[PDB]
Amino acid sequence: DPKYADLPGIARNEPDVYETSDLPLEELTSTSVEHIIVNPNAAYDKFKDKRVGTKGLDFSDRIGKTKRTGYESGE
Amino acid sequence: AALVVDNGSGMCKAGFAGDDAPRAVFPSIVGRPRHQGVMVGMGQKDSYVGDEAQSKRGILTLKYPIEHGIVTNWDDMEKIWHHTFYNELRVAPEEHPVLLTEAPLNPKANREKMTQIMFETFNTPAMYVAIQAVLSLYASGRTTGIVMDSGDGVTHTVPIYEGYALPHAILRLDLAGRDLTDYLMKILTERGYSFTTTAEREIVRDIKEKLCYVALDFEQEMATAASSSSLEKSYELPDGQVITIGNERFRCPEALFQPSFLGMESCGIHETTFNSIMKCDVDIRKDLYANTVLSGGTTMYPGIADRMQKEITALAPSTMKIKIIAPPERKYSVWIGGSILASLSTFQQMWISKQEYDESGPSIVHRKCF
Amino acid sequence: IANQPVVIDNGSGVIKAGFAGDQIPKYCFPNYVGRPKHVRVMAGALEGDIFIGPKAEEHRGLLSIRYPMEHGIVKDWNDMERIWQYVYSKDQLQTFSEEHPVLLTEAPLNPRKNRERAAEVFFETFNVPALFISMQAVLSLYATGRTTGVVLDSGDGVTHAVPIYEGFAMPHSIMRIDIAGRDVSRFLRLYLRKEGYDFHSSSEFEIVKAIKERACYLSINPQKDETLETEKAQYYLPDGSTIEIGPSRFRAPELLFRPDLIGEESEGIHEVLVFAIQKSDMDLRRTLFSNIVLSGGSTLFKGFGDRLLSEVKKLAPKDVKIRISAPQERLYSTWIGGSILASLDTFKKMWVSKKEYEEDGARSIHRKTF
Amino acid sequence: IANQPVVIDNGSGVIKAGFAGDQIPKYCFPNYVGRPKHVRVMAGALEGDIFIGPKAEEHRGLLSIRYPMEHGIVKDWNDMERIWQYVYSKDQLQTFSEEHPVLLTEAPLNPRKNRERAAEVFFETFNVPALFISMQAVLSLYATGRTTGVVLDSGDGVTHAVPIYEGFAMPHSIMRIDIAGRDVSRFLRLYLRKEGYDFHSSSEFEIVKAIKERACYLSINPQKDETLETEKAQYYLPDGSTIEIGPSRFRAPELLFRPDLIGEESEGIHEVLVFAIQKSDMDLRRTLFSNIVLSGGSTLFKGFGDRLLSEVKKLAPKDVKIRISAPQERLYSTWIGGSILASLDTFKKMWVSKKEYEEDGARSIHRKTF
Numbered sequence A: 001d002p003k004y005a006d007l008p009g010i011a012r013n014e015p016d017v018y019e020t021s022d023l024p025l026e027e028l029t030s031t032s033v034e035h036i037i038v039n040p041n042a043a044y045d046k047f048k049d050k051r052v053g054t055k056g057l058d059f060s061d062r063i064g065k066t067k068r069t070g071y072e073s074g075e
Numbered sequence B: 001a002a003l004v005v006d007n008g009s010g011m012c013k014a015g016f017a018g019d020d021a022p023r024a025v026f027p028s029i030v031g032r033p034r035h036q037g038v039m040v041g042m043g044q045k046d047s048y049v050g051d052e053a054q055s056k057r058g059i060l061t062l063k064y065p066i067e068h069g070i071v072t073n074w075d076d077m078e079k080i081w082h083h084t085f086y087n088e089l090r091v092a093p094e095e096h097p098v099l100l101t102e103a104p105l106n107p108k109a110n111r112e113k114m115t116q117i118m119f120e121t122f123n124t125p126a127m128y129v130a131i132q133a134v135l136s137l138y139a140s141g142r143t144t145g146i147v148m149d150s151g152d153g154v155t156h157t158v159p160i161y162e163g164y165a166l167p168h169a170i171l172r173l174d175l176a177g178r179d180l181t182d183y184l185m186k187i188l189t190e191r192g193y194s195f196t197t198t199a200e201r202e203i204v205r206d207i208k209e210k211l212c213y214v215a216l217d218f219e220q221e222m223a224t225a226a227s228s229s230s231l232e233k234s235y236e237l238p239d240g241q242v243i244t245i246g247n248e249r250f251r252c253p254e255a256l257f258q259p260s261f262l263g264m265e266s267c268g269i270h271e272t273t274f275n276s277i278m279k280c281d282v283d284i285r286k287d288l289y290a291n292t293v294l295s296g297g298t299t300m301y302p303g304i305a306d307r308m309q310k311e312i313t314a315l316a317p318s319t320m321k322i323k324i325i326a327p328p329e330r331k332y333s334v335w336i337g338g339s340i341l342a343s344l345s346t347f348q349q350m351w352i353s354k355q356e357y358d359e360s361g362p363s364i365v366h367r368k369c370f
Numbered sequence C, D: 001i002a003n004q005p006v007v008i009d010n011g012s013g014v015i016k017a018g019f020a021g022d023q024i025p026k027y028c029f030p031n032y033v034g035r036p037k038h039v040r041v042m043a044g045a046l047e048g049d050i051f052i053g054p055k056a057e058e059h060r061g062l063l064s065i066r067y068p069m070e071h072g073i074v075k076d077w078n079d080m081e082r083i084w085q086y087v088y089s090k091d092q093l094q095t096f097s098e099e100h101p102v103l104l105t106e107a108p109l110n111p112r113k114n115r116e117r118a119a120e121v122f123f124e125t126f127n128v129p130a131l132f133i134s135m136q137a138v139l140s141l142y143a144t145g146r147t148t149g150v151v152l153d154s155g156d157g158v159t160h161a162v163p164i165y166e167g168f169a170m171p172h173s174i175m176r177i178d179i180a181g182r183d184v185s186r187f188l189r190l191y192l193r194k195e196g197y198d199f200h201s202s203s204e205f206e207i208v209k210a211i212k213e214r215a216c217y218l219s220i221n222p223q224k225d226e227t228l229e230t231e232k233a234q235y236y237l238p239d240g241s242t243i244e245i246g247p248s249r250f251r252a253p254e255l256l257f258r259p260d261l262i263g264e265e266s267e268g269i270h271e272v273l274v275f276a277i278q279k280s281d282m283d284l285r286r287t288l289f290s291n292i293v294l295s296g297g298s299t300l301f302k303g304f305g306d307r308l309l310s311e312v313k314k315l316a317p318k319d320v321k322i323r324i325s326a327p328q329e330r331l332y333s334t335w336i337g338g339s340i341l342a343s344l345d346t347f348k349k350m351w352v353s354k355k356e357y358e359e360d361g362a363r364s365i366h367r368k369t370f
């Protein structure tokens, strides 16, 4: 303010800012598909006590010794 | 008896079907004067067109009606077609049927409005729109092979094998002659010689066509340009003033091969030609490498073919043989194809008639385009 | 281990990361590496040459976008390393990679070299305790809480159908097609150019993805909706300019059901589902048709469920009960499955330890994944 | 050397000098060389044949004014050396140029020979420790204290629009037109002759610049003010004589916003601002419209911001927020930016040392610029 009062070629009695006036899911509600509510807390409890047998596991494309089925049994 | 009229963004090539070369070739521009409120002298035309506007460049503001193969101002394009038929060719449009050329993957409104004018304004008996790339193959007597038809407006890559086109393999790039002309102005302004006005931009296009050449190794060429003044050539303007463009000679056409210079963030004219072949079926790739055509006047740069071969060969497999097809008449490659197509008795059936247009509408063109 | 294992769903469009047990993924950001294309001149501007996730989304116009993985295959691994690094950085989960085990979620029938390198990076660059690679479909079933179901997972990169009956997944009945959400956005861009609105820039391609998500409906009858004159629904771009999408709105997402449009000789999303069921043994066909689970973000299209149910019914046998079940969080369904699997004590046995990987090598990961 | 750096703005009209410590430029004098109008053979006349700044302003009518710099380019270098020597005189600053380092402010997209010769002078003639050439636009943002912002810098010689977002300047989006304050002064002289007051002399051109600076208001609607009868406001000349300006007052600076009226092929001040934003990426357009900064002396016209806002709004997209943030110190904004930049410890790294220029070569100044 006193800085710009010192200089000669300065804008006096002019507005600083010239601005404009400040101006102020469809598939998920379908009949065809059946809407399920995902509750992981409920899901976690159902699978809680289920185990898998990783002994003698081989999912790879290995030909040796007939067919294999990964995850034998639980407990 | 039929008319071929190429609607190129840079130059409009028009002529009679069957003839070797196009009859009338003029720059596609409309020249409106920088008029003040002061009264004008005698022999005054409200809006000049083509060779007339090319003579009176000084005062007239040059406005290209077709921008990137899209007709922006239709009133301007109408005045060019009026200069094409009545004045340049000296023929009635009602008598002869007119073949026009559109670039591939253009807006649908362009083809729609184009034919509407030809049928209503000029009252043509028949009208067929064709892809520029499809015509360019006929010039070389080749049914099989890809083309890299780089124009002033756009550059497009259309692979066609055994007289069957692959539409999904077609790629369009907005980088073209006018962008290079605009790029050449900026780097000439960096040297010292400032060119701003529309008339001055036309003089920069004359500088580009004559001097500019494609370098084999850009980094190697920049090293020789810095050390020695052997590449530096002089050009006389319309004014007695002469200019020495220097390294900017071979810097302009480099923008084709690396758009990063222009700042488009897109693949180069070499890389897009490769990408288009890879998008095609694996079997037919062999012939497309063997038959890579370069069409339009943006492929008349001295030594583009050598640089093109080098860049494709590096990207492509080592076992494959890459041959670039560069005929002497590349500028008139789109038209000369049209002349061969229109002349053939088979094409007589493919014409869209007034009766066909009247009943169906302008939408009929989209069915009988290609 | 006392420290919770981190679930990372390495999706093509959006990578979703978070801790096991959490009901929803806390930190989900778009999968791309943003580099600044414009030059830095001023002091105090945005620091770094790499922008990932929300910082990249805010300053999108400044940056040039580059997707690291395409069709569920990591093309650039250097970029994939930086995004996984960003997951562990202060902005997202903010923990050390050495303390928490990881759960990675790759698509089915991807290349073996991808799984090998994915493991190499996650064990060497990050010193993770344990990594388990799993299929997207197997997890999606744990989330819904169902043992029997076919999982049609239409992602951004790849759309696949995996028939799973009473825990077991049938590896020979797995059907995968490259055509997916990102190809629909690419096919939409092509049709927007035909309408006469160009989106050449990598940043502008993200606006085409935004147009797709907001305004695109799958018509129940394709040939019917083609003929009828459509209401030209205007969309507001980021700058403010209005575009009329018109016919391209409903023609674009039809690519998923008809891959002939883009010009790829593959099965449609409707054909993929029925083929997957028909490939399975006679007895289970009726149970798999009854239990269909949609997954991925590209199933959220308006009238996808309506169209698929129409298309499946024609191909499927007469008088069979076809129930298509949609979890409300289709997009996050894959991750939620990961969290539930990770929380179980059985997951401890499933893991590959560092020492186990170090001894055997690549084989150990291939042995234990499906 | 640690001693305070000397900022100097290379303004075609007014060069602004001073130290980096000062909040405002202490010494700012007109950029023209003053020689006696009558060719002086005799004694008792103006001695030295050199009058610069305040000495020239005193004996103005006797001397003949010759501007050394035209359109942001140095035409006469011998004159410019004398001007920069007067910056290091007893009149202004009163210091050794060999002690203090220097910062120049060259306009964007100037000739490279202009930058090279500017450095050669400041390193050879004056024995400067270090020199740094910078862009006028980038400085203007440092003064205001915002990283993002478009800078419409309307000087005396050149008017240029540079868009910078988050400290990243897009070099392709820069727009430069030669129609600046000096051209408005030239066109006002023509209209003053149309009112019937001749200012033929080079000294009499200076008072036309004073008449312009004193009384010239930009009407919101130009057509309504022309039909309305003017007050004919009297201006007082140095001799004492009165001149009634009348309609010439408002229809002179209009030629900035509409340069086709006189017959100059340019875009216009409203157009270059909008075009510069539209040329930039779509994501940034909204933020660049929301941050516009007016710089230079040819924005201080009464009702410039009022007209520009109206002329930008109609060209710009509908329902977009347009904030044209003018500082109070527009004339001295470019220097204040340099004064802040110079003060920072980062500037120590940015500038090129005298020994660096001797060893590295000519490129040294160009490569370190950005």
Ligand SMILES: Nc1ncnc2c1ncn2[C@@H]1O[C@H](COP(=O)(O)OP(=O)(O)OP(=O)(O)O)[C@@H](O)[C@H]1O
Residues within 6 Å of the ligand: B006, B007, B008, B009, B010, B011, B012, B101, B132, B150, B151, B152, B153, B154, B177, B178, B181, B205, B208, B209, B210, B295, B296, B297, B298, B300, B301, B302, B331, B334
């Ligand atoms: N010999 C040349 N060397 C370099 N550039 C040239 C040469 N001749 C023309 N050009 C440039 O390339 C453009 C070639 O335009 P051309 O005459 O092929 O018409 P066009 O509008 O591109 O038509 P089309 O798109 O149908 O090919 C010119 O506008 C010019 O900028």
Ligand SMILES: Nc1ncnc2c1ncn2[C@@H]1O[C@H](COP(=O)(O)OP(=O)(O)O)[C@@H](O)[C@H]1O
Residues within 6 Å of the ligand: A025, C009, C010, C011, C012, C013, C014, C153, C154, C155, C156, C157, C158, C181, C182, C185, C209, C212, C213, C214, C295, C296, C297, C298, C299, C300, C301, C302, C330, C331, C334
């Ligand atoms: N509302 C929507 N409508 C249509 N498509 C959508 C919608 N939301 C997202 N998409 C699409 O789905 C993609 C998200 O894929 P996503 O399910 O996250 O992948 P993945 O399953 O491989 O992790 C988006 O990139 C977009 O293409």
Ligand SMILES: Nc1ncnc2c1ncn2[C@@H]1O[C@H](COP(=O)(O)OP(=O)(O)O)[C@@H](O)[C@H]1O
Residues within 6 Å of the ligand: A009, A010, D009, D010, D011, D012, D013, D014, D015, D154, D155, D156, D157, D181, D182, D185, D209, D212, D213, D214, D295, D296, D297, D298, D300, D301, D330, D331, D334
């Ligand atoms: N108060 C004013 N009102 C109108 N025009 C002015 C005013 N002050 C300066 N000008 C004009 O602007 C010019 C000053 O330009 P300037 O801002 O010094 O340019 P630069 O940014 O290149 O240094 C003067 O020569 C005059 O034409």
